[PDB]
Ligand SMILES: CC(=O)N[C@H]1[C@H](O[C@H]2[C@@H](O)[C@@H](NC(C)=O)[C@H](O[C@H]3[C@H](O)[C@H]4N=C(N(C)C)O[C@H]4[C@@H]3CO)O[C@@H]2CO)O[C@H](CO)[C@@H](O)[C@H]1O
Ligand SMILES: CC(=O)N[C@H]1[C@H](O[C@H]2[C@@H](O)[C@@H](NC(C)=O)[C@H](O[C@H]3[C@H](O)[C@H]4N=C(N(C)C)O[C@H]4[C@@H]3CO)O[C@@H]2CO)O[C@H](CO)[C@@H](O)[C@H]1O
Ligand SMILES: [Zn+2]
Ligand SMILES: [Zn+2]
């Protein structure tokens with residue numbers, strides 16, 4: 050089984066003990082470590098932070114402690130948008146330039162592969178034709194990586210992609226069967242199902258639907274996302290179940306109405322370290338002393354509330370449940386976003402270092 054873990058290069062800017070650098074990484078924890086995020090300039094893979102060249106060397110240098118570890122560099126992300134991808138995949142010359150730059154960039158810094166995180170082809174402003182151009186990009190990369198390993202004598206570069214769980218986004222941008230044949234693995238982003246953009250509370254990553262949900266809403270859960278990718282053509286062994294080490298928060302309209310589905314007036318207060326209203330790292334959820342914890346029985350996940358604040362998140366128990374689920378489905382493993390949001394130095398939760406991700410390592 051694979052345990053794919055994402056590192057983010059902006060976590061190094063958080064305050065105090067929340068600051069995260071490659072030295073905070075445990076090389077033995079995961080099977081694959083993915084570096085988020087590289088960007089694109091003139092159709093070529095590029096760095097995004099002042100010290101990326103040093104961080105890349107430190108990150109890949111972890112393989113000197115664990116040679117079995119595979120590292121990948123992720124390009125894109127939610128904030129990256131779609132314009133640069135659309136433009137890059139539109140012509141054979143742009144695709145060639147990007148592919149050749151990817152090979153040179155990855156070899157230069159000792160990465161073992163590339164993780165595509167285009168969010169998303171066929172949506173967010175990207176035309177419907179990008180569904181087919183995304184396929185061509187995946188094929189071009191897989192082909193170029195295959196040939197380069199043969200000419201260089203080095204281990205073949207890996208190709209993975211982070212993909213959406215929402216049925217509407219899957220149908221709009223992915224020829225699932227085709228890309229699954231050329232990707233080494235698929236990192237299913239089975240989270241962000243509900244959030245503060247809604248007027249009601251809802252869990253970020255529920256395993257199953259609530260009895261009360263039907264229609265399109267009945268597909269806003271991990272199980273539905275998984276079934277969709279498998280039914281559409283993804284071999285089970287290539288489907289990696291993504292799990293969040295963060296939760297999504299809400300400000301309740303009333304501290305007396307605290308159920309999942311209760312009215313909400315907006316995002317929950319920003320975390321003192323993550324500072325993005327609407328989400329909280331697991332270590333920020335751990336500091337909620339005096340809060341009431343509840344388990345959503347239908348969905349197998351927890352949430353906590355204190356006064357008018359409500360947050361749906363994942364804990365050791367829900368991670369154990371999800372691993373039990375993925376094993377029963379025969380999935381290739383688990384993926385986690387992100388290392389720097391787990392209690393990576395065991396400071397906040399008194400559950401040791403990486404309580405959530407260590408749980409994945411042990412259960413898998
Ligand atoms: C580089 C950058 O824009 N940095 C921003 C930072 O943006 C982040 C956060 O909003 C992340 N959100 C959370 C809850 O972690 C967000 O995570 C996305 C990611 O883009 C997607 N890709 C994956 N993969 C598995 C590849 O998973 C999803 C996750 C979870 O939905 O990523 C964006 C950057 O794209 O936000 C902070 C706070 O607003 C800001 O200071 C700055 O550092
Ligand atoms: C609260 C708000 O308006 N914006 C948030 C932003 O919320 C986004 C992201 O969390 C999306 N995450 C990813 C990886 O795309 C999330 O996508 C989910 C959602 O269930 C469906 N909506 C989309 N879109 C492309 C809109 O795709 C699916 C996927 C599930 O497959 O949607 C929410 C709401 O739009 O999150 C960022 C990062 O935390 C935050 O800075 C803020 O911009
Ligand atoms: Zn430190
Ligand atoms: Zn261009």
Ligand SMILES: [Zn+2]
Pocket residue numbers: 242243244247251269
């Ligand atoms: Zn919802």
